[model samples]
Target: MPHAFKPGDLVFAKMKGYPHWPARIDDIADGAVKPPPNKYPIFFFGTHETAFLGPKDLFPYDKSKDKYGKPNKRKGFNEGLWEIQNNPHASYS
Candidate 1:
Protein backbone atom coordinates (compact mmCIF):
# COMPACT_ATOMS: atom_id res chain seq x y z
CA MET A 1 0.00 0.00 0.00
CA PRO A 2 1.05 3.59 -0.54
CA HIS A 3 2.25 5.71 2.40
CA ALA A 4 -0.80 6.61 4.46
CA PHE A 5 0.95 9.41 6.38
CA LYS A 6 3.91 11.76 6.36
CA PRO A 7 5.82 14.12 8.63
CA GLY A 8 3.70 16.90 10.21
CA ASP A 9 0.55 14.83 9.68
CA LEU A 10 -1.68 14.27 12.68
CA VAL A 11 -3.04 10.74 13.21
CA PHE A 12 -5.36 9.10 15.65
CA ALA A 13 -4.52 5.94 17.54
CA LYS A 14 -7.67 3.78 17.20
CA MET A 15 -7.82 3.88 21.05
CA LYS A 16 -8.26 0.10 20.92
CA GLY A 17 -4.81 -1.49 21.06
CA TYR A 18 -2.66 1.62 21.08
CA PRO A 19 -2.01 4.48 23.50
CA HIS A 20 -5.61 5.65 23.28
CA TRP A 21 -4.72 9.16 22.11
CA PRO A 22 -3.92 11.29 19.10
CA ALA A 23 -0.34 11.44 17.84
CA ARG A 24 1.89 13.36 15.45
CA ILE A 25 4.42 11.88 13.04
CA ASP A 26 7.87 13.37 13.52
CA ASP A 27 10.98 12.24 11.72
CA ILE A 28 12.86 11.72 15.01
CA ALA A 29 12.00 9.98 18.22
CA ASP A 30 12.87 11.06 21.82
CA GLY A 31 16.63 11.41 21.28
CA ALA A 32 18.84 10.01 18.60
CA VAL A 33 20.18 12.26 15.88
CA LYS A 34 18.27 10.19 13.34
CA PRO A 35 15.20 7.93 13.50
CA PRO A 36 13.31 5.42 11.44
CA PRO A 37 9.88 5.79 9.87
CA ASN A 38 6.92 5.63 12.29
CA LYS A 39 5.99 1.99 12.88
CA TYR A 40 6.79 -1.02 15.03
CA PRO A 41 10.16 -0.59 16.73
CA ILE A 42 10.34 2.91 15.28
CA PHE A 43 8.88 5.30 17.88
CA PHE A 44 6.40 8.16 17.69
CA PHE A 45 4.82 10.53 20.23
CA GLY A 46 1.29 10.85 21.60
CA THR A 47 0.23 14.49 21.96
CA HIS A 48 3.85 15.55 22.19
CA GLU A 49 4.45 13.44 25.23
CA THR A 50 7.25 10.87 25.67
CA ALA A 51 8.18 8.39 23.00
CA PHE A 52 5.46 5.95 21.89
CA LEU A 53 4.80 3.93 18.77
CA GLY A 54 2.37 1.38 17.38
CA PRO A 55 1.39 -0.60 14.31
CA LYS A 56 0.71 1.47 11.23
CA ASP A 57 -2.29 -0.70 10.38
CA LEU A 58 -4.30 0.56 13.37
CA PHE A 59 -3.97 4.20 12.30
CA PRO A 60 -6.72 5.10 9.86
CA TYR A 61 -7.50 8.28 8.00
CA ASP A 62 -8.87 10.97 10.35
CA LYS A 63 -11.59 11.78 7.73
CA SER A 64 -11.02 15.46 8.44
CA LYS A 65 -10.18 16.21 4.86
CA ASP A 66 -12.27 16.13 1.70
CA LYS A 67 -11.94 13.39 -0.90
CA TYR A 68 -10.81 16.06 -3.34
CA GLY A 69 -7.64 16.41 -1.21
CA LYS A 70 -8.53 19.84 0.14
CA PRO A 71 -7.43 20.22 3.73
CA ASN A 72 -10.39 20.80 6.01
CA LYS A 73 -8.81 22.74 8.86
CA ARG A 74 -10.64 21.50 11.90
CA LYS A 75 -10.14 22.98 15.35
CA GLY A 76 -8.55 20.94 18.12
CA PHE A 77 -6.82 21.37 21.47
CA ASN A 78 -3.84 23.10 19.92
CA GLU A 79 -5.83 24.79 17.22
CA GLY A 80 -8.68 26.02 19.39
CA LEU A 81 -8.13 25.67 23.11
CA TRP A 82 -4.37 26.02 23.22
CA GLU A 83 -1.68 28.25 21.79
CA ILE A 84 -1.54 29.23 18.14
CA GLN A 85 -5.31 28.99 18.03
CA ASN A 86 -5.65 29.95 14.39
CA ASN A 87 -2.65 28.06 13.03
CA PRO A 88 -2.34 24.44 14.10
CA HIS A 89 1.05 22.83 14.14
CA ALA A 90 2.60 19.66 15.62
CA SER A 91 5.47 19.36 18.09
CA TYR A 92 8.30 16.85 18.32
CA SER A 93 10.56 15.34 20.94
Candidate 2:
Protein backbone atom coordinates (compact mmCIF):
# COMPACT_ATOMS: atom_id res chain seq x y z
CA MET A 1 0.00 0.00 0.00
CA PRO A 2 3.08 2.26 0.38
CA HIS A 3 6.33 2.25 -1.56
CA ALA A 4 8.64 4.66 -3.37
CA PHE A 5 9.13 4.13 -7.05
CA LYS A 6 12.73 4.43 -8.14
CA PRO A 7 14.03 5.55 -11.46
CA GLY A 8 14.08 2.75 -14.07
CA ASP A 9 11.49 0.58 -12.31
CA LEU A 10 9.19 -0.67 -14.98
CA VAL A 11 5.72 -0.12 -13.48
CA PHE A 12 2.10 0.23 -14.31
CA ALA A 13 1.00 3.86 -14.51
CA LYS A 14 -2.28 4.27 -12.66
CA MET A 15 -5.00 6.45 -14.03
CA LYS A 16 -8.57 7.51 -13.23
CA GLY A 17 -10.71 6.04 -15.95
CA TYR A 18 -8.17 4.60 -18.31
CA PRO A 19 -6.67 1.17 -17.78
CA HIS A 20 -3.31 0.98 -16.07
CA TRP A 21 -0.55 0.76 -18.63
CA PRO A 22 3.07 -0.32 -18.53
CA ALA A 23 5.32 2.68 -17.92
CA ARG A 24 8.91 3.26 -16.89
CA ILE A 25 10.11 5.62 -14.22
CA ASP A 26 12.48 7.69 -16.29
CA ASP A 27 13.31 10.18 -13.54
CA ILE A 28 12.26 11.67 -10.22
CA ALA A 29 12.20 15.16 -8.70
CA ASP A 30 10.79 17.39 -6.00
CA GLY A 31 7.44 19.11 -6.20
CA ALA A 32 8.40 22.76 -6.60
CA VAL A 33 9.91 25.74 -4.81
CA LYS A 34 7.20 25.49 -2.15
CA PRO A 35 6.83 21.69 -2.24
CA PRO A 36 3.91 19.42 -1.30
CA PRO A 37 4.00 16.16 -3.26
CA ASN A 38 7.16 14.19 -3.96
CA LYS A 39 7.03 11.72 -6.82
CA TYR A 40 8.00 10.99 -10.40
CA PRO A 41 7.20 11.76 -14.00
CA ILE A 42 7.06 8.46 -15.84
CA PHE A 43 7.01 7.53 -19.49
CA PHE A 44 4.30 5.20 -20.69
CA PHE A 45 5.56 2.52 -23.05
CA GLY A 46 3.89 1.70 -26.40
CA THR A 47 2.22 5.12 -26.48
CA HIS A 48 5.04 7.45 -25.38
CA GLU A 49 2.82 9.00 -22.75
CA THR A 50 4.26 10.87 -19.78
CA ALA A 51 2.70 12.06 -16.54
CA PHE A 52 3.51 13.01 -12.99
CA LEU A 53 2.39 10.10 -10.83
CA GLY A 54 2.63 9.15 -7.17
CA PRO A 55 4.51 6.21 -5.67
CA LYS A 56 1.41 4.11 -5.10
CA ASP A 57 0.38 4.89 -8.64
CA LEU A 58 3.29 2.74 -9.77
CA PHE A 59 3.18 -1.04 -9.27
CA PRO A 60 6.52 -2.91 -9.31
CA TYR A 61 7.57 -4.76 -12.45
CA ASP A 62 8.09 -8.25 -11.05
CA LYS A 63 5.13 -8.03 -8.72
CA SER A 64 2.77 -8.71 -11.56
CA LYS A 65 -0.07 -7.18 -9.59
CA ASP A 66 -1.68 -3.83 -9.01
CA LYS A 67 -1.70 -1.93 -5.74
CA TYR A 68 -4.91 -3.63 -4.63
CA GLY A 69 -3.45 -6.97 -5.71
CA LYS A 70 -5.45 -7.42 -8.88
CA PRO A 71 -4.50 -9.20 -12.09
CA ASN A 72 -2.04 -6.95 -13.89
CA LYS A 73 -1.20 -6.62 -17.62
CA ARG A 74 -4.96 -6.65 -18.34
CA LYS A 75 -4.15 -9.70 -20.46
CA GLY A 76 -2.00 -9.16 -23.59
CA PHE A 77 -1.62 -5.43 -23.73
CA ASN A 78 2.15 -5.22 -24.15
CA GLU A 79 5.41 -7.02 -23.51
CA GLY A 80 6.42 -8.69 -20.26
CA LEU A 81 8.17 -6.60 -17.63
CA TRP A 82 11.40 -8.60 -17.88
CA GLU A 83 11.34 -8.88 -21.64
CA ILE A 84 10.64 -5.20 -22.08
CA GLN A 85 13.20 -4.18 -19.51
CA ASN A 86 15.83 -6.34 -21.20
CA ASN A 87 15.39 -4.82 -24.66
CA PRO A 88 12.71 -2.18 -24.88
CA HIS A 89 12.35 0.12 -27.87
CA ALA A 90 12.38 3.30 -25.81
CA SER A 91 14.38 6.45 -25.19
CA TYR A 92 16.34 7.23 -22.03
CA SER A 93 19.08 9.35 -20.47
Candidate 3:
Protein backbone atom coordinates (compact mmCIF):
# COMPACT_ATOMS: atom_id res chain seq x y z
CA MET A 1 0.00 0.00 0.00
CA PRO A 2 2.98 2.30 0.62
CA HIS A 3 2.08 5.84 1.75
CA ALA A 4 -1.12 5.76 -0.28
CA PHE A 5 -3.07 6.64 2.85
CA LYS A 6 -1.54 9.65 4.54
CA PRO A 7 -2.30 11.83 7.60
CA GLY A 8 -5.69 12.96 6.33
CA ASP A 9 -7.40 9.59 6.13
CA LEU A 10 -10.65 7.85 7.03
CA VAL A 11 -12.66 4.67 6.60
CA PHE A 12 -15.95 2.92 7.39
CA ALA A 13 -14.55 0.19 9.62
CA LYS A 14 -16.79 -2.70 10.56
CA MET A 15 -15.16 -5.38 12.55
CA LYS A 16 -16.83 -7.87 15.03
CA GLY A 17 -20.17 -7.99 13.17
CA TYR A 18 -21.42 -4.86 15.01
CA PRO A 19 -22.52 -1.61 13.42
CA HIS A 20 -19.64 0.09 11.65
CA TRP A 21 -18.80 3.74 12.29
CA PRO A 22 -16.93 6.58 10.65
CA ALA A 23 -13.27 6.70 11.66
CA ARG A 24 -10.23 8.89 11.07
CA ILE A 25 -6.88 7.44 10.12
CA ASP A 26 -3.83 8.25 12.22
CA ASP A 27 -1.06 10.69 11.22
CA ILE A 28 2.70 11.09 10.85
CA ALA A 29 3.78 14.72 11.54
CA ASP A 30 3.23 14.31 15.30
CA GLY A 31 5.37 11.22 15.42
CA ALA A 32 2.22 9.06 15.39
CA VAL A 33 3.97 6.34 13.42
CA LYS A 34 1.96 4.79 10.65
CA PRO A 35 0.98 1.18 10.82
CA PRO A 36 1.93 -1.66 8.51
CA PRO A 37 0.71 -1.63 4.90
CA ASN A 38 -1.36 -4.76 5.43
CA LYS A 39 -3.04 -3.03 8.43
CA TYR A 40 -3.49 0.43 9.95
CA PRO A 41 -4.75 2.41 12.96
CA ILE A 42 -7.83 4.64 13.07
CA PHE A 43 -9.87 6.91 15.36
CA PHE A 44 -13.49 5.76 15.39
CA PHE A 45 -16.68 7.83 15.72
CA GLY A 46 -19.95 6.55 17.29
CA THR A 47 -17.52 4.55 19.39
CA HIS A 48 -15.88 7.99 19.69
CA GLU A 49 -12.43 6.77 20.51
CA THR A 50 -8.89 6.75 19.11
CA ALA A 51 -6.97 3.55 18.81
CA PHE A 52 -3.89 2.00 17.19
CA LEU A 53 -5.60 -0.40 14.80
CA GLY A 54 -8.43 -2.09 12.90
CA PRO A 55 -8.88 -3.48 9.40
CA LYS A 56 -10.00 -1.13 6.59
CA ASP A 57 -12.42 -3.49 4.91
CA LEU A 58 -13.80 -0.89 2.49
CA PHE A 59 -10.93 -0.90 0.02
CA PRO A 60 -12.33 -0.69 -3.52
CA TYR A 61 -11.50 0.53 -7.04
CA ASP A 62 -8.60 -1.95 -6.89
CA LYS A 63 -6.70 0.52 -4.71
CA SER A 64 -6.79 2.87 -1.66
CA LYS A 65 -9.16 5.50 -3.07
CA ASP A 66 -11.86 3.80 -1.06
CA LYS A 67 -15.63 4.10 -1.37
CA TYR A 68 -15.75 7.70 -2.51
CA GLY A 69 -19.48 8.10 -2.06
CA LYS A 70 -22.00 9.78 0.22
CA PRO A 71 -22.28 6.59 2.24
CA ASN A 72 -21.28 8.59 5.29
CA LYS A 73 -24.62 10.40 5.23
CA ARG A 74 -26.55 7.16 5.11
CA LYS A 75 -28.10 7.39 8.55
CA GLY A 76 -31.35 8.02 10.35
CA PHE A 77 -32.19 11.68 11.05
CA ASN A 78 -33.36 11.10 14.62
CA GLU A 79 -30.41 8.87 15.32
CA GLY A 80 -28.13 11.85 14.92
CA LEU A 81 -30.32 13.95 17.19
CA TRP A 82 -30.28 11.20 19.78
CA GLU A 83 -26.48 11.12 19.82
CA ILE A 84 -26.13 14.83 20.70
CA GLN A 85 -28.71 14.47 23.45
CA ASN A 86 -26.37 12.37 25.60
CA ASN A 87 -22.88 12.04 24.17
CA PRO A 88 -20.71 14.15 26.49
CA HIS A 89 -18.01 14.76 23.91
CA ALA A 90 -20.44 16.78 21.84
CA SER A 91 -18.50 15.26 18.95
CA TYR A 92 -21.52 15.50 16.74
CA SER A 93 -22.72 18.94 17.63
Candidate 4:
Protein backbone atom coordinates (compact mmCIF):
# COMPACT_ATOMS: atom_id res chain seq x y z
CA MET A 1 0.00 0.00 0.00
CA PRO A 2 1.07 3.59 -0.51
CA HIS A 3 2.33 5.64 2.43
CA ALA A 4 -0.55 6.84 4.62
CA PHE A 5 1.16 10.03 5.68
CA LYS A 6 4.26 12.17 5.14
CA PRO A 7 6.54 14.47 7.11
CA GLY A 8 5.07 17.74 8.43
CA ASP A 9 1.54 16.36 8.33
CA LEU A 10 -0.66 16.64 11.45
CA VAL A 11 -2.65 13.49 12.14
CA PHE A 12 -4.94 12.28 14.90
CA ALA A 13 -4.31 9.17 16.96
CA LYS A 14 -7.09 7.70 19.10
CA MET A 15 -5.56 6.37 22.29
CA LYS A 16 -7.21 4.07 24.81
CA GLY A 17 -8.52 6.67 27.33
CA TYR A 18 -7.47 10.04 26.02
CA PRO A 19 -9.19 12.24 23.46
CA HIS A 20 -7.72 12.13 19.97
CA TRP A 21 -4.54 14.19 19.83
CA PRO A 22 -2.90 15.54 16.70
CA ALA A 23 0.66 14.37 16.03
CA ARG A 24 2.98 16.15 13.69
CA ILE A 25 5.23 13.89 11.65
CA ASP A 26 8.86 14.98 11.84
CA ASP A 27 10.70 12.19 10.05
CA ILE A 28 10.41 8.65 8.60
CA ALA A 29 12.87 5.83 8.99
CA ASP A 30 13.41 2.16 9.73
CA GLY A 31 15.56 0.86 12.62
CA ALA A 32 16.43 4.45 13.49
CA VAL A 33 13.78 5.17 16.11
CA LYS A 34 12.61 2.97 19.04
CA PRO A 35 9.97 0.77 17.44
CA PRO A 36 10.09 -3.04 17.29
CA PRO A 37 11.64 -4.75 14.29
CA ASN A 38 9.27 -4.24 11.38
CA LYS A 39 9.44 -4.52 7.62
CA TYR A 40 7.95 -1.07 7.05
CA PRO A 41 9.28 2.28 8.19
CA ILE A 42 7.88 4.14 11.21
CA PHE A 43 7.02 7.75 11.74
CA PHE A 44 8.76 10.07 14.19
CA PHE A 45 6.24 12.43 15.74
CA GLY A 46 6.01 14.85 18.66
CA THR A 47 8.50 17.42 19.92
CA HIS A 48 11.93 17.07 21.55
CA GLU A 49 10.26 17.00 24.98
CA THR A 50 8.36 13.90 23.91
CA ALA A 51 8.57 11.45 21.03
CA PHE A 52 6.48 8.66 19.51
CA LEU A 53 7.83 6.24 16.93
CA GLY A 54 5.40 3.72 15.51
CA PRO A 55 4.35 1.95 12.34
CA LYS A 56 2.15 3.85 9.92
CA ASP A 57 -0.65 1.33 10.31
CA LEU A 58 -0.64 1.81 14.11
CA PHE A 59 -2.04 5.30 13.78
CA PRO A 60 -5.86 5.31 13.43
CA TYR A 61 -6.38 8.51 11.55
CA ASP A 62 -7.85 9.59 8.20
CA LYS A 63 -4.97 11.08 6.30
CA SER A 64 -7.35 12.27 3.55
CA LYS A 65 -8.60 15.15 5.73
CA ASP A 66 -6.95 17.29 8.35
CA LYS A 67 -8.05 18.36 11.86
CA TYR A 68 -8.98 21.82 10.59
CA GLY A 69 -10.09 20.88 7.09
CA LYS A 70 -13.43 22.65 7.22
CA PRO A 71 -12.83 25.66 9.36
CA ASN A 72 -15.80 27.89 8.53
CA LYS A 73 -18.28 25.00 8.64
CA ARG A 74 -17.54 24.05 12.25
CA LYS A 75 -20.12 24.89 14.90
CA GLY A 76 -20.31 26.85 18.16
CA PHE A 77 -17.07 27.99 19.79
CA ASN A 78 -14.79 26.64 17.11
CA GLU A 79 -16.67 28.30 14.27
CA GLY A 80 -16.81 31.50 16.27
CA LEU A 81 -13.06 31.53 16.54
CA TRP A 82 -12.58 30.80 12.85
CA GLU A 83 -14.92 33.61 11.94
CA ILE A 84 -13.27 36.03 14.31
CA GLN A 85 -9.81 35.35 12.98
CA ASN A 86 -10.78 35.42 9.33
CA ASN A 87 -12.82 38.59 9.58
CA PRO A 88 -12.07 41.96 11.08
CA HIS A 89 -14.57 41.91 13.94
CA ALA A 90 -13.15 43.35 17.14
CA SER A 91 -16.42 44.25 18.90
CA TYR A 92 -18.86 41.70 20.34
CA SER A 93 -21.47 40.45 17.92
Residue-wise C-alpha lDDT for candidate 4, range 1-93, written one tens digit per residue: 755555544444333553334334444436555434442232212211224544433443355235432333212334433432343122221
Best by lDDT: 2
Q: Candidate 3, overall lDDT?
A: 0.45
Off by over 4 Å in 3: 1-3, 28-37, 52-93
After best superposition, candidate 2 residue 92: deviation in angstroms? Answer: 6.9
Candidate 1: stretches off by over 4 Å: 14-19, 29-47, 52-61, 64-93
**Model 3 shows how many backbone clashes?**
0
Q: Which residue pairs come into collision in candidate 1?
A: none
lDDT of 1 by residue, 15-50 (tens): 434433344445555674554445532222323443
Candidate 2 — which pairs collide? Answer: none
The model with the greater lDDT, 1 or 2, is 2
Model 3, position 27: C-alpha lDDT score: 51
Q: What does candidate 2 score on TM?
A: 0.60
Q: How well does candidate 3 score on lDDT at residue 10?
A: 50
Which candidate model has the greater TM-score, 2 or 4?
2
Compared with the true structure, all predictions reach lDDT values of: 0.39, 0.61, 0.45, 0.37
RMSD of 1: 7.5
On TM-score, who's better, 1 or 3? 3
Residue 84's C-alpha lDDT in candidate 3? 25
Residue range with the least summed lDDT across 10 consecutive positions in model 2? 68-77
